[PDB]
Amino acid sequence: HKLVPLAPADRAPAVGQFWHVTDLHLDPTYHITDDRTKVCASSKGANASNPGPFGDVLCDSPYQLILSAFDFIKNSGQEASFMIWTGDSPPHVPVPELSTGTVIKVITNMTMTVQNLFPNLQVFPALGNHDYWPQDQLPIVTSKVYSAVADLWKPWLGEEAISTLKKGGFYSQKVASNPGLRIISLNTNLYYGPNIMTLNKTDPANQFEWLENTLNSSLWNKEKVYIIAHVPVGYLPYATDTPAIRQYYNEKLLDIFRRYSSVIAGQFYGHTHRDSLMVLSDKNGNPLNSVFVAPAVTPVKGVLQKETNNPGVRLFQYKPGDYTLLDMVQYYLNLTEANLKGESNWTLEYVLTQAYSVADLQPKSLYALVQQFATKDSKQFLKYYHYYFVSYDSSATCDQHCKTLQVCAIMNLDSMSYDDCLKQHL
Ligand SMILES: *[C@@H]1O[C@H](CO)[C@@H](O[C@@H]2O[C@H](CO)[C@@H](O[C@@H]3O[C@H](CO[C@H]4O[C@H](CO)[C@@H](O)[C@H](O)[C@@H]4O)[C@@H](O)[C@H](O[C@H]4O[C@H](CO)[C@@H](O)[C@H](O)[C@@H]4O)[C@@H]3O)[C@H](O)[C@H]2NC(C)=O)[C@H](O)[C@H]1NC(C)=O
Numbered sequence: 001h002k003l004v005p006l007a008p009a010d011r012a013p014a015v016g017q018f019w020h021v022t023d024l025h026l027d028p029t030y031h032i033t034d035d036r037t038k039v040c041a042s043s044k045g046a047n048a049s050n051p052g053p054f055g056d057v058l059c060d061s062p063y064q065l066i067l068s069a070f071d072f073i074k075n076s077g078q079e080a081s082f083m084i085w086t087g088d089s090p091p092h093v094p095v096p097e098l099s100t101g102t103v104i105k106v107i108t109n110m111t112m113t114v115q116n117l118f119p120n121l122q123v124f125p126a127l128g129n130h131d132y133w134p135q136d137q138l139p140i141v142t143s144k145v146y147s148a149v150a151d152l153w154k155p156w157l158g159e160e161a162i163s164t165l166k167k168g169g170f171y172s173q174k175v176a177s178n179p180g181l182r183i184i185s186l187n188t189n190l191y192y193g194p195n196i197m198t199l200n201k202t203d204p205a206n207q208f209e210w211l212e213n214t215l216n217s218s219l220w221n222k223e224k225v226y227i228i229a230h231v232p233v234g235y236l237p238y239a240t241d242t243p244a245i246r247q248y249y250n251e252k253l254l255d256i257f258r259r260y261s262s263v264i265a266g267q268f269y270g271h272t273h274r275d276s277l278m279v280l281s282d283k284n285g286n287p288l289n290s291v292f293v294a295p296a297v298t299p300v301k302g303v304l305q306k307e308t309n310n311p312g313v314r315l316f317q318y319k320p321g322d323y324t325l326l327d328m329v330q331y332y333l334n335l336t337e338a339n340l341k342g343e344s345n346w347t348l349e350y351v352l353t354q355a356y357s358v359a360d361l362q363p364k365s366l367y368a369l370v371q372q373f374a375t376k377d378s379k380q381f382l383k384y385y386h387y388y389f390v391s392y393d394s395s396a397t398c399d400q401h402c403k404t405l406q407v408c409a410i411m412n413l414d415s416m417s418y419d420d421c422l423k424q425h426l
């Protein structure tokens with residue numbers, strides 16, 4: 001007779017789950033036609049290679065592909081308490097073939113697709129470099145795009161997040177279903193090489209100052225943080241000595257992340273359209289923070305590229321009320337198979353703990369895994385390189401130089417450690 005909360009069973013609490021989708025790149029022009037240079041504007045006059053209803057390797061996403069990805073999520077039987085969505089919705093076409101209004105229209109379409117299919121799911125979006133017109137030129141003051149996405153994403157975001165989103169394209173937001181968890185959605189396009197608007201800016205849109213204060217508040221309020229953004233920190237794994245964002249910004253952002261590694265329980269990026277791991281470590285090689293780059297829904301590649309990705313979406317598992325990452329489940333569409341029969345079969349690619357025989361996704365667990373990658377003829381690394389393209393080509397090979405670039409980028413996010421890795425292993 002005392003109105004005490006009803007104690008749950010001693011059963012093990014169910015893990016929490018959330019979805020990560022990225023790089024949808026809708027191409028509204030997509031359509032099958034005899035002249036394969038007219039299947040999709042995103043091929044920029046190239047002949048589509050083998051187009052079907054779910055797309056082509058030289059095209060961005062037909063609407064039907066994006067719909068099939070979200071239909072899979074909806075009917076997967078996986079419970080999830082939120083979704084993160086890390087940007088890049090318009091297609092790869094020349095700047096004169098887009099406009100601010102067209103960019104906003106595509107982002108609106110994607111946003112409304114998600115809200116229509118998932119009316120009860122909190123979603124945390126981030127802007128990508130194509131989520132602006134002209135592409136990559138994301139500004140350091142308020143803009144029409146920033147104001148538009150602030151209105152589009154209002155169902156998911158509180159007043160303070162809406163205010164910072166409108167001003168600079170970034171926000172933080174408490175997760176309604178997960179007390180003690182905060183999402184920080186950065187606009188890392190402010191740091192991306194092609195962005196003229198941020199040249200010679202030490203703190204464009206004051207995002208570093210804001211991020212510092214946000215993380216400090218989370219620290220003192222005993223919150224955990226998941227960082228989400230479009231362009232990742234660290235080095236491109238397919239190129240030599242090339243940071244994904246400008247080196248000055250990479251170094252500055254990584255130092256913030258190292259100082260707050262005790263608060264940051266995950267980092268989640270897109271932009272590369274590949275499945276990549278990174279482990280942020282100190283200068284002495286001690287692992288600090290696990291980083292997850294998710295592959296795209298679009299399969300697009302340029303004619304000059306040999307490989308591309310299969311479409312992917314992924315799910316993370318975490319410890320409830322604690323937010324330590326326990327696992328990652330990567331799903332994919334075999335695009336050639338789907339196009340041949342005309343029906344999608346989104347399916348499991350792998351479960352990270354099972355694929356790699358690791359206990360969880362903590363930095364030390366992943367650090368020990370990637371140390372195995374470095375061993376000669378590592379079967380773990382061969383599997384990783386297969387999954388890098390989302391199982392596009394089991395015959396794709398990574399020679400000694402390719403593997404040095406991959407492993408060095410996985411383990412060394414800052415310039416000093418990355419260049420030392422090249423010195424030791426080239
Ligand atoms: C996603 O879905 C696609 C489509 O089903 C799968 O791709 C097919 O995979 C099978 C098996 O790997 C391929 O069949 C094999 O092809 C080999 C030839 O390689 C290429 O050569 C021709 C050029 O002449 C290409 O056009 C062709 O597409 C291939 O890419 C052959 O050497 C094999 O022959 C022998 O294989 C075994 C031997 O035990 C036997 O089954 C056969 O009888 C034969 O003796 C075999 O035919 C098939 O070609 C692929 N199709 C396409 C369109 O690429 C992907 O594997 C799948 N992805 C994942 C991750 O599962």
Ligand SMILES: *[C@@H]1O[C@H](CO[C@@H]2O[C@@H](C)[C@@H](O)[C@@H](O)[C@@H]2O)[C@@H](O[C@@H]2O[C@H](CO)[C@@H](O)[C@H](O)[C@H]2NC(C)=O)[C@H](O)[C@H]1NC(C)=O
Pocket residue numbers: 036037045046047
């Ligand atoms: C796009 O492709 C067309 C068609 O090329 C053919 O189509 C394929 C199915 C395959 O069979 C190829 O080997 C063929 O060549 C190209 O147009 C043709 O190109 C050659 C001359 O270079 C010749 O077949 C015809 O003169 C061209 N026209 C047609 C209707 O066949 C076209 O050049 C390709 N465009 C690009 C940008 O690659």
Ligand SMILES: *[C@@H]1O[C@H](CO[C@@H]2O[C@@H](C)[C@@H](O)[C@@H](O)[C@@H]2O)[C@@H](O[C@@H]2O[C@H](CO)[C@@H](O)[C@H](O)[C@H]2NC(C)=O)[C@H](O)[C@H]1NC(C)=O
Pocket residue numbers: 028063064105106108109110112113
């Ligand atoms: C989202 O778009 C799809 C795809 O259509 C294109 O995408 C938009 C960005 C915009 O440019 C549209 O004008 C394009 O047609 C829409 O699906 C299509 O909708 C129309 C009906 O209005 C219909 O003619 C098509 O057959 C539909 N299907 C396909 C595969 O194109 C979809 O309705 C849009 N969704 C939202 C919520 O806006």
Ligand SMILES: *[C@@H]1O[C@H](CO[C@@H]2O[C@@H](C)[C@@H](O)[C@@H](O)[C@@H]2O)[C@@H](O)[C@H](O)[C@H]1NC(C)=O
Pocket residue numbers: 212213216217220
């Ligand atoms: C980080 O915050 C420290 C703690 O100060 C208190 O933090 C919360 C509760 C705020 O309400 C603030 O007003 C409090 O004073 C600061 O002492 C410290 O300066 C901050 N560190 C940095 C690097 O900004």
Ligand SMILES: Nc1ncnc2c1ncn2[C@@H]1O[C@H](COP(=O)(O)O)[C@@H](O)[C@H]1O
Pocket residue numbers: 088092129130238271272302305
């Ligand atoms: N694996 C790759 N090889 C060569 N170029 C790439 C690769 N991945 C991405 N790019 C380039 O990076 C950009 C793609 O990012 P985005 O345009 O934001 O989707 C384009 O300029 C591509 O040409």
Ligand SMILES: [Zn+2]
Pocket residue numbers: 023025088128271272273296
């Ligand atoms: Zn992209």
Ligand SMILES: [Zn+2]
Pocket residue numbers: 088128129130230271272
């Ligand atoms: Zn991008």
